[PDB]
PDB file of C-alpha atoms and ligand atoms in Angstrom:
ATOM      1  CA  UNK A   1     145.822 164.488 185.001  1.00 35.36           C
ATOM      2  CA  UNK A   2     145.226 162.314 181.930  1.00 33.24           C
ATOM      3  CA  UNK A   3     144.576 165.140 179.462  1.00 34.17           C
ATOM      4  CA  UNK A   4     147.596 167.101 180.588  1.00 34.54           C
ATOM      5  CA  UNK A   5     149.703 163.911 180.025  1.00 35.26           C
ATOM      6  CA  UNK A   6     148.285 163.709 176.487  1.00 33.53           C
ATOM      7  CA  UNK A   7     149.160 167.327 175.883  1.00 33.58           C
ATOM      8  CA  UNK A   8     152.788 166.488 176.727  1.00 33.04           C
ATOM      9  CA  UNK A   9     152.665 163.578 174.321  1.00 29.81           C
ATOM     10  CA  UNK A  10     152.169 166.075 171.448  1.00 28.98           C
ATOM     11  CA  UNK A  11     153.665 158.861 169.113  1.00 31.48           C
ATOM     12  CA  UNK A  12     152.339 162.391 168.590  1.00 29.50           C
ATOM     13  CA  UNK A  13     149.520 160.966 166.396  1.00 29.38           C
ATOM     14  CA  UNK A  14     148.212 158.644 169.177  1.00 29.62           C
ATOM     15  CA  UNK A  15     147.720 161.467 171.658  1.00 26.02           C
ATOM     16  CA  UNK A  16     146.136 163.691 169.045  1.00 22.34           C
ATOM     17  CA  UNK A  17     143.660 160.990 168.043  1.00 20.12           C
ATOM     18  CA  UNK A  18     142.818 160.257 171.720  1.00 19.16           C
ATOM     19  CA  UNK A  19     142.333 163.918 172.568  1.00 17.10           C
ATOM     20  CA  UNK A  20     140.006 164.450 169.609  1.00 16.90           C
ATOM     21  CA  UNK A  21     137.703 161.611 170.771  1.00 14.94           C
ATOM     22  CA  UNK A  22     137.519 163.156 174.295  1.00 13.34           C
ATOM     23  CA  UNK A  23     134.960 165.912 173.622  1.00 16.13           C
ATOM     24  CA  UNK A  24     135.309 169.610 174.478  1.00 11.78           C
ATOM     25  CA  UNK A  25     138.195 169.125 176.921  1.00 13.88           C
ATOM     26  CA  UNK A  26     140.354 167.159 174.499  1.00 19.73           C
ATOM     27  CA  UNK A  27     139.440 169.420 171.593  1.00 18.42           C
ATOM     28  CA  UNK A  28     140.256 172.501 173.671  1.00 18.22           C
ATOM     29  CA  UNK A  29     143.714 171.118 174.285  1.00 20.29           C
ATOM     30  CA  UNK A  30     144.218 170.555 170.544  1.00 21.21           C
ATOM     31  CA  UNK A  31     143.022 174.074 169.760  1.00 18.75           C
ATOM     32  CA  UNK A  32     145.395 175.556 172.292  1.00 17.95           C
ATOM     33  CA  UNK A  33     148.241 173.568 170.714  1.00 17.73           C
ATOM     34  CA  UNK A  34     147.510 175.168 167.336  1.00 17.97           C
ATOM     35  CA  UNK A  35     147.346 178.631 168.929  1.00 16.19           C
ATOM     36  CA  UNK A  36     150.834 178.075 170.328  1.00 13.56           C
ATOM     37  CA  UNK A  37     152.349 176.699 167.079  1.00 11.39           C
ATOM     38  CA  UNK A  38     150.663 178.484 164.132  1.00 12.76           C
ATOM     39  CA  UNK A  39     151.791 179.924 161.753  1.00 11.87           C
ATOM     40  CA  UNK A  40     154.424 177.280 161.315  1.00 13.28           C
ATOM     41  CA  UNK A  41     157.887 178.269 160.307  1.00 17.24           C
ATOM     42  CA  UNK A  42     159.179 174.779 159.540  1.00 18.08           C
ATOM     43  CA  UNK A  43     156.696 172.063 158.597  1.00 18.07           C
ATOM     44  CA  UNK A  44     155.835 170.094 161.769  1.00 17.24           C
ATOM     45  CA  UNK A  45     153.741 167.008 161.149  1.00 16.17           C
ATOM     46  CA  UNK A  46     152.083 167.111 164.601  1.00 15.63           C
ATOM     47  CA  UNK A  47     150.699 170.542 163.847  1.00 16.28           C
ATOM     48  CA  UNK A  48     149.373 169.356 160.501  1.00 16.81           C
ATOM     49  CA  UNK A  49     147.806 166.382 162.242  1.00 16.23           C
ATOM     50  CA  UNK A  50     146.166 168.448 164.956  1.00 16.28           C
ATOM     51  CA  UNK A  51     144.602 170.848 162.424  1.00 22.32           C
ATOM     52  CA  UNK A  52     143.444 168.084 160.077  1.00 21.01           C
ATOM     53  CA  UNK A  53     142.117 165.809 162.895  1.00 22.12           C
ATOM     54  CA  UNK A  54     140.018 168.770 164.113  1.00 18.04           C
ATOM     55  CA  UNK A  55     138.820 169.546 160.567  1.00 15.38           C
ATOM     56  CA  UNK A  56     137.862 165.894 160.118  1.00 13.18           C
ATOM     57  CA  UNK A  57     135.493 166.030 163.052  1.00 15.99           C
ATOM     58  CA  UNK A  58     133.208 167.965 160.756  1.00 14.08           C
ATOM     59  CA  UNK A  59     131.626 170.095 163.490  1.00 10.82           C
ATOM     60  CA  UNK A  60     130.361 173.622 162.726  1.00 11.80           C
ATOM     61  CA  UNK A  61     131.893 175.386 165.764  1.00 12.60           C
ATOM     62  CA  UNK A  62     135.341 173.774 165.381  1.00 11.06           C
ATOM     63  CA  UNK A  63     135.439 174.297 161.634  1.00  9.73           C
ATOM     64  CA  UNK A  64     134.202 177.895 162.041  1.00 14.14           C
ATOM     65  CA  UNK A  65     136.852 178.634 164.686  1.00 12.02           C
ATOM     66  CA  UNK A  66     139.617 177.127 162.512  1.00 12.77           C
ATOM     67  CA  UNK A  67     138.548 179.219 159.536  1.00 10.85           C
ATOM     68  CA  UNK A  68     138.394 182.339 161.697  1.00 11.57           C
ATOM     69  CA  UNK A  69     141.793 181.822 163.427  1.00 12.57           C
ATOM     70  CA  UNK A  70     143.605 180.202 160.536  1.00  9.95           C
ATOM     71  CA  UNK A  71     141.848 181.475 157.396  1.00  4.18           C
ATOM     72  CA  UNK A  72     144.836 180.445 155.211  1.00  2.82           C
ATOM     73  CA  UNK A  73     145.642 177.317 157.174  1.00  4.71           C
ATOM     74  CA  UNK A  74     148.717 176.551 159.299  1.00  6.91           C
ATOM     75  CA  UNK A  75     151.522 177.178 156.831  1.00  5.72           C
ATOM     76  CA  UNK A  76     152.589 180.490 155.177  1.00  7.29           C
ATOM     77  CA  UNK A  77     151.327 180.469 151.572  1.00  7.64           C
ATOM     78  CA  UNK A  78     154.530 181.822 150.093  1.00 10.05           C
ATOM     79  CA  UNK A  79     155.445 182.083 146.415  1.00 13.69           C
ATOM     80  CA  UNK A  80     158.437 183.546 144.713  1.00 13.56           C
ATOM     81  CA  UNK A  81     156.015 184.498 141.892  1.00 12.31           C
ATOM     82  CA  UNK A  82     153.084 185.796 143.955  1.00 14.25           C
ATOM     83  CA  UNK A  83     150.903 182.752 143.175  1.00 13.39           C
ATOM     84  CA  UNK A  84     147.703 182.154 145.234  1.00  9.77           C
ATOM     85  CA  UNK A  85     147.934 178.842 147.042  1.00  5.51           C
ATOM     86  CA  UNK A  86     144.819 179.225 149.152  1.00  5.79           C
ATOM     87  CA  UNK A  87     142.572 177.140 146.870  1.00  7.37           C
ATOM     88  CA  UNK A  88     145.156 174.334 147.145  1.00  8.55           C
ATOM     89  CA  UNK A  89     145.115 174.636 150.938  1.00  9.87           C
ATOM     90  CA  UNK A  90     141.319 174.651 150.990  1.00  9.51           C
ATOM     91  CA  UNK A  91     141.067 171.481 148.933  1.00  6.77           C
ATOM     92  CA  UNK A  92     143.614 169.792 151.190  1.00 10.25           C
ATOM     93  CA  UNK A  93     141.883 170.948 154.384  1.00  7.31           C
ATOM     94  CA  UNK A  94     138.679 169.417 153.015  1.00  7.17           C
ATOM     95  CA  UNK A  95     140.568 166.240 152.196  1.00  4.25           C
ATOM     96  CA  UNK A  96     139.451 166.606 148.560  1.00  4.98           C
ATOM     97  CA  UNK A  97     142.656 165.122 147.260  1.00  4.40           C
ATOM     98  CA  UNK A  98     141.379 164.851 143.675  1.00  6.18           C
ATOM     99  CA  UNK A  99     140.722 168.564 143.455  1.00  7.66           C
ATOM    100  CA  UNK A 100     144.044 169.224 145.253  1.00  7.72           C
ATOM    101  CA  UNK A 101     145.780 167.166 142.610  1.00  9.85           C
ATOM    102  CA  UNK A 102     144.118 169.098 139.718  1.00  8.69           C
ATOM    103  CA  UNK A 103     145.010 172.404 141.373  1.00 10.25           C
ATOM    104  CA  UNK A 104     148.643 171.366 141.950  1.00  6.83           C
ATOM    105  CA  UNK A 105     148.920 170.434 138.238  1.00  7.52           C
ATOM    106  CA  UNK A 106     147.526 173.801 137.212  1.00  9.67           C
ATOM    107  CA  UNK A 107     149.747 175.685 139.694  1.00  8.77           C
ATOM    108  CA  UNK A 108     152.938 173.993 138.439  1.00  8.20           C
ATOM    109  CA  UNK A 109     152.096 175.185 134.913  1.00  6.92           C
ATOM    110  CA  UNK A 110     151.369 178.707 136.306  1.00  2.91           C
ATOM    111  CA  UNK A 111     154.699 178.634 138.099  1.00  5.51           C
ATOM    112  CA  UNK A 112     156.539 177.663 134.864  1.00  7.87           C
ATOM    113  CA  UNK A 113     155.079 180.611 133.073  1.00  8.05           C
ATOM    114  CA  UNK A 114     152.925 181.612 130.054  1.00  9.01           C
ATOM    115  CA  UNK A 115     154.193 178.820 127.765  1.00  6.60           C
ATOM    116  CA  UNK A 116     153.443 176.044 130.160  1.00  9.68           C
ATOM    117  CA  UNK A 117     150.147 177.653 131.057  1.00  5.86           C
ATOM    118  CA  UNK A 118     149.148 177.678 127.423  1.00  7.63           C
ATOM    119  CA  UNK A 119     150.267 174.220 126.460  1.00  9.77           C
ATOM    120  CA  UNK A 120     149.100 172.812 129.871  1.00  8.95           C
ATOM    121  CA  UNK A 121     152.149 170.599 130.429  1.00  9.36           C
ATOM    122  CA  UNK A 122     155.747 171.019 131.517  1.00  8.91           C
ATOM    123  CA  UNK A 123     159.194 170.757 129.992  1.00  8.49           C
ATOM    124  CA  UNK A 124     161.848 169.289 132.236  1.00  9.47           C
ATOM    125  CA  UNK A 125     163.977 172.476 131.902  1.00 10.74           C
ATOM    126  CA  UNK A 126     161.097 174.504 133.343  1.00 11.83           C
ATOM    127  CA  UNK A 127     160.989 172.171 136.321  1.00 10.30           C
ATOM    128  CA  UNK A 128     164.711 172.580 136.867  1.00 11.56           C
ATOM    129  CA  UNK A 129     164.209 176.342 137.030  1.00 11.35           C
ATOM    130  CA  UNK A 130     161.258 176.320 139.444  1.00 11.25           C
ATOM    131  CA  UNK A 131     161.831 178.493 142.469  1.00  9.27           C
ATOM    132  CA  UNK A 132     162.437 176.361 145.575  1.00  6.34           C
ATOM    133  CA  UNK A 133     160.084 178.444 147.698  1.00  5.40           C
ATOM    134  CA  UNK A 134     156.941 177.511 145.708  1.00  4.32           C
ATOM    135  CA  UNK A 135     157.838 173.851 145.659  1.00  2.00           C
ATOM    136  CA  UNK A 136     158.378 173.956 149.453  1.00  2.60           C
ATOM    137  CA  UNK A 137     154.932 175.551 149.973  1.00  2.00           C
ATOM    138  CA  UNK A 138     153.154 173.061 147.698  1.00  4.46           C
ATOM    139  CA  UNK A 139     154.944 170.100 149.218  1.00  3.34           C
ATOM    140  CA  UNK A 140     154.416 171.280 152.770  1.00  3.65           C
ATOM    141  CA  UNK A 141     150.671 171.570 152.172  1.00  5.98           C
ATOM    142  CA  UNK A 142     150.417 168.081 150.740  1.00  7.71           C
ATOM    143  CA  UNK A 143     152.539 166.622 153.524  1.00  6.70           C
ATOM    144  CA  UNK A 144     150.894 168.482 156.432  1.00  7.03           C
ATOM    145  CA  UNK A 145     147.407 167.554 155.319  1.00  7.28           C
ATOM    146  CA  UNK A 146     148.089 163.840 154.614  1.00  5.95           C
ATOM    147  CA  UNK A 147     149.919 162.687 157.822  1.00  3.16           C
ATOM    148  CA  UNK A 148     153.070 162.785 155.701  1.00  4.09           C
ATOM    149  CA  UNK A 149     151.614 160.182 153.260  1.00  2.00           C
ATOM    150  CA  UNK A 150     151.548 162.499 150.231  1.00  2.00           C
ATOM    151  CA  UNK A 151     154.012 164.977 148.621  1.00  6.51           C
ATOM    152  CA  UNK A 152     156.781 165.074 146.075  1.00  6.82           C
ATOM    153  CA  UNK A 153     159.241 164.830 148.939  1.00  8.38           C
ATOM    154  CA  UNK A 154     157.654 161.465 149.852  1.00  7.77           C
ATOM    155  CA  UNK A 155     157.976 160.182 146.275  1.00  7.89           C
ATOM    156  CA  UNK A 156     161.531 161.392 146.123  1.00  8.23           C
ATOM    157  CA  UNK A 157     162.478 159.479 149.246  1.00  2.93           C
ATOM    158  CA  UNK A 158     160.829 156.300 147.883  1.00  5.06           C
ATOM    159  CA  UNK A 159     162.667 156.866 144.615  1.00  5.02           C
ATOM    160  CA  UNK A 160     165.979 157.155 146.455  1.00  4.05           C
ATOM    161  CA  UNK A 161     165.051 153.958 148.339  1.00  5.07           C
ATOM    162  CA  UNK A 162     164.441 152.283 144.928  1.00  4.86           C
ATOM    163  CA  UNK A 163     167.956 152.917 143.696  1.00  5.57           C
ATOM    164  CA  UNK A 164     166.527 155.689 141.527  1.00  9.22           C
ATOM    165  CA  UNK A 165     164.898 153.042 139.371  1.00  6.28           C
ATOM    166  CA  UNK A 166     161.547 154.439 138.249  1.00  6.43           C
ATOM    167  CA  UNK A 167     160.340 150.951 137.301  1.00  5.50           C
ATOM    168  CA  UNK A 168     160.684 150.041 140.996  1.00  5.81           C
ATOM    169  CA  UNK A 169     159.055 153.276 142.085  1.00  4.73           C
ATOM    170  CA  UNK A 170     155.752 152.975 140.207  1.00  6.27           C
ATOM    171  CA  UNK A 171     154.414 149.876 141.938  1.00  7.49           C
ATOM    172  CA  UNK A 172     155.436 151.185 145.311  1.00  5.07           C
ATOM    173  CA  UNK A 173     153.360 154.382 144.886  1.00  2.00           C
ATOM    174  CA  UNK A 174     150.478 152.650 142.980  1.00  4.43           C
ATOM    175  CA  UNK A 175     151.022 154.115 139.527  1.00  5.55           C
ATOM    176  CA  UNK A 176     151.552 150.739 137.878  1.00  7.15           C
ATOM    177  CA  UNK A 177     150.371 147.289 138.790  1.00  4.30           C
ATOM    178  CA  UNK A 178     152.581 144.805 136.971  1.00 10.34           C
ATOM    179  CA  UNK A 179     152.553 145.740 133.313  1.00  8.24           C
ATOM    180  CA  UNK A 180     149.396 147.844 133.688  1.00  5.54           C
ATOM    181  CA  UNK A 181     149.604 151.600 134.160  1.00  4.81           C
ATOM    182  CA  UNK A 182     147.060 153.016 136.587  1.00  6.35           C
ATOM    183  CA  UNK A 183     144.396 154.718 134.424  1.00  5.41           C
ATOM    184  CA  UNK A 184     143.590 158.378 135.073  1.00  3.81           C
ATOM    185  CA  UNK A 185     141.340 159.437 136.690  1.00  2.44           C
ATOM    186  CA  UNK A 186     139.284 156.493 137.967  1.00  2.00           C
ATOM    187  CA  UNK A 187     142.151 154.102 138.689  1.00  2.00           C
ATOM    188  CA  UNK A 188     143.758 156.262 141.315  1.00  2.29           C
ATOM    189  CA  UNK A 189     143.009 156.304 145.028  1.00  2.00           C
ATOM    190  CA  UNK A 190     141.873 159.758 146.117  1.00  2.00           C
ATOM    191  CA  UNK A 191     142.049 159.187 149.853  1.00  2.00           C
ATOM    192  CA  UNK A 192     144.437 158.293 152.704  1.00  2.02           C
ATOM    193  CA  UNK A 193     144.004 154.590 152.068  1.00  2.04           C
ATOM    194  CA  UNK A 194     146.285 155.146 149.116  1.00  3.77           C
ATOM    195  CA  UNK A 195     149.955 153.974 149.297  1.00  6.50           C
ATOM    196  CA  UNK A 196     152.648 156.297 150.614  1.00  8.29           C
ATOM    197  CA  UNK A 197     153.619 158.679 147.855  1.00  5.47           C
ATOM    198  CA  UNK A 198     150.496 158.122 145.733  1.00  8.46           C
ATOM    199  CA  UNK A 199     149.790 161.852 145.238  1.00  4.87           C
ATOM    200  CA  UNK A 200     150.393 164.295 143.669  1.00  4.45           C
ATOM    201  CA  UNK A 201     150.263 162.605 140.309  1.00  5.37           C
ATOM    202  CA  UNK A 202     152.941 163.119 137.638  1.00  5.74           C
ATOM    203  CA  UNK A 203     151.564 162.019 134.239  1.00  5.77           C
ATOM    204  CA  UNK A 204     154.045 159.672 132.510  1.00  5.88           C
ATOM    205  CA  UNK A 205     152.517 160.254 129.024  1.00  9.29           C
ATOM    206  CA  UNK A 206     155.605 162.297 128.108  1.00 10.12           C
ATOM    207  CA  UNK A 207     158.174 160.231 129.938  1.00  7.93           C
ATOM    208  CA  UNK A 208     159.891 160.510 133.281  1.00  8.81           C
ATOM    209  CA  UNK A 209     162.034 163.594 132.514  1.00 13.06           C
ATOM    210  CA  UNK A 210     159.762 166.005 134.444  1.00  9.84           C
ATOM    211  CA  UNK A 211     159.543 163.664 137.466  1.00 12.84           C
ATOM    212  CA  UNK A 212     163.293 163.145 137.560  1.00 11.19           C
ATOM    213  CA  UNK A 213     164.018 166.850 137.327  1.00 11.48           C
ATOM    214  CA  UNK A 214     161.519 167.477 140.072  1.00 11.83           C
ATOM    215  CA  UNK A 215     163.008 164.850 142.421  1.00  9.87           C
ATOM    216  CA  UNK A 216     166.508 166.148 141.728  1.00 10.48           C
ATOM    217  CA  UNK A 217     165.565 169.812 142.326  1.00 12.47           C
ATOM    218  CA  UNK A 218     167.648 171.507 145.087  1.00 12.22           C
ATOM    219  CA  UNK A 219     164.591 172.371 147.155  1.00 12.48           C
ATOM    220  CA  UNK A 220     164.442 168.997 148.950  1.00 14.12           C
ATOM    221  CA  UNK A 221     167.944 169.233 150.420  1.00 15.52           C
ATOM    222  CA  UNK A 222     167.701 173.040 150.921  1.00 12.06           C
ATOM    223  CA  UNK A 223     164.611 172.796 153.118  1.00 16.69           C
ATOM    224  CA  UNK A 224     165.440 169.500 154.829  1.00 17.74           C
ATOM    225  CA  UNK A 225     162.887 167.267 153.102  1.00 15.60           C
TER     226      UNK A 225
HETATM  227  C1  DE9 B   1     152.385 155.777 130.603  1.00 16.65           C
HETATM  228  C2  DE9 B   1     151.154 156.593 130.547  1.00 16.65           C
HETATM  229  C3  DE9 B   1     150.498 156.971 129.380  1.00 16.65           C
HETATM  230  C4  DE9 B   1     149.390 157.744 129.717  1.00 16.65           C
HETATM  231  C5  DE9 B   1     148.458 158.240 128.763  1.00 16.65           C
HETATM  232  C6  DE9 B   1     147.647 159.458 129.146  1.00 16.65           C
HETATM  233  N1  DE9 B   1     147.515 160.042 130.318  1.00 16.65           N
HETATM  234  C7  DE9 B   1     146.686 161.077 130.269  1.00 16.65           C
HETATM  235  C8  DE9 B   1     146.205 162.041 131.248  1.00 16.65           C
HETATM  236  C9  DE9 B   1     146.753 161.954 132.628  1.00 16.65           C
HETATM  237  N2  DE9 B   1     147.457 160.952 133.233  1.00 16.65           N
HETATM  238  C10 DE9 B   1     147.719 161.257 134.521  1.00 16.65           C
HETATM  239  C11 DE9 B   1     148.476 160.515 135.549  1.00 16.65           C
HETATM  240  C12 DE9 B   1     149.305 159.375 135.150  1.00 16.65           C
HETATM  241  N3  DE9 B   1     149.428 158.863 133.903  1.00 16.65           N
HETATM  242  C13 DE9 B   1     150.350 157.833 134.018  1.00 16.65           C
HETATM  243  C14 DE9 B   1     150.848 156.920 133.033  1.00 16.65           C
HETATM  244  C15 DE9 B   1     150.448 157.134 131.571  1.00 16.65           C
HETATM  245  N4  DE9 B   1     149.389 157.824 131.072  1.00 16.65           N
HETATM  246  C16 DE9 B   1     150.807 157.766 135.306  1.00 16.65           C
HETATM  247  C17 DE9 B   1     150.193 158.749 136.061  1.00 16.65           C
HETATM  248  C18 DE9 B   1     150.390 159.117 137.478  1.00 16.65           C
HETATM  249  C19 DE9 B   1     147.160 162.537 134.765  1.00 16.65           C
HETATM  250  C20 DE9 B   1     147.219 163.253 136.074  1.00 16.65           C
HETATM  251  C21 DE9 B   1     146.533 162.919 133.587  1.00 16.65           C
HETATM  252  C22 DE9 B   1     145.775 164.232 133.439  1.00 16.65           C
HETATM  253  C23 DE9 B   1     146.615 165.402 133.130  1.00 16.65           C
HETATM  254  C24 DE9 B   1     147.117 165.392 131.754  1.00 16.65           C
HETATM  255  O1  DE9 B   1     146.369 165.341 130.759  1.00 16.65           O
HETATM  256  O2  DE9 B   1     148.414 165.506 131.523  1.00 16.65           O
HETATM  257  C25 DE9 B   1     146.260 161.113 128.925  1.00 16.65           C
HETATM  258  C26 DE9 B   1     145.298 162.148 128.331  1.00 16.65           C
HETATM  259  C27 DE9 B   1     146.038 163.458 128.056  1.00 16.65           C
HETATM  260  C28 DE9 B   1     145.523 164.403 127.102  1.00 16.65           C
HETATM  261  O3  DE9 B   1     144.459 164.124 126.519  1.00 16.65           O
HETATM  262  O4  DE9 B   1     146.014 165.570 126.959  1.00 16.65           O
HETATM  263  C29 DE9 B   1     146.815 160.125 128.194  1.00 16.65           C
HETATM  264  C30 DE9 B   1     146.668 159.873 126.732  1.00 16.65           C
END
């Protein structure tokens, strides 16, 4: 039957979208898919898309069931430093990308330690020493909850495709428009209409050293990003 065919299609995005618009039957199939695939080991975009598509329906019973079954979301919230990533997950699950961006900024300082937490900005050497595990968790959350549109991994791949020229990267990801830097916070696009790689933001006020160290970090290759 048609719904079963759609289940097999889990192109993944098209089936998921169709199933979600097909009432209780379609939504049941999506819920069963999560039950069979969560918690994720590796990030799988289809699973992120099923969860987020269901969240986006904004229906009490679905949302309540998701919170009950998956109170911490679909991806293990692991940290080499014991950091709490649930508020980041919650902001992303609500598609509140502006809050998610603020939390990510705060969490990176927390990850770097007392000094960064106090000054509220990073040195490139702190970024180089970040544990891979935390960067993987943070990136996975952004990626899984944005249909792969957001994440440092996404920016890194665009940077690689720009010959590592940051001046070519900024317009691609919407951080500069010609000679004009995008102005924080109102100039940015806090939704999925934003260009690929738009979030999370890396303030350029202190130069590109932090961003470059982040994109060169071993985590991306290590975890297959
Ligand atoms: C080239 C350039 C200069 C510049 C000048 C500033 N940006 C700021 C703040 C910020 N700019 C941001 C993002 C970006 N700025 C970009 C380019 C530039 N911004 C590009 C992006 C994605 C973000 C996220 C903040 C808030 C966090 C923070 O204060 O560090 C602030 C206020 C910072 C402060 O008062 O501490 C200034 C002066």
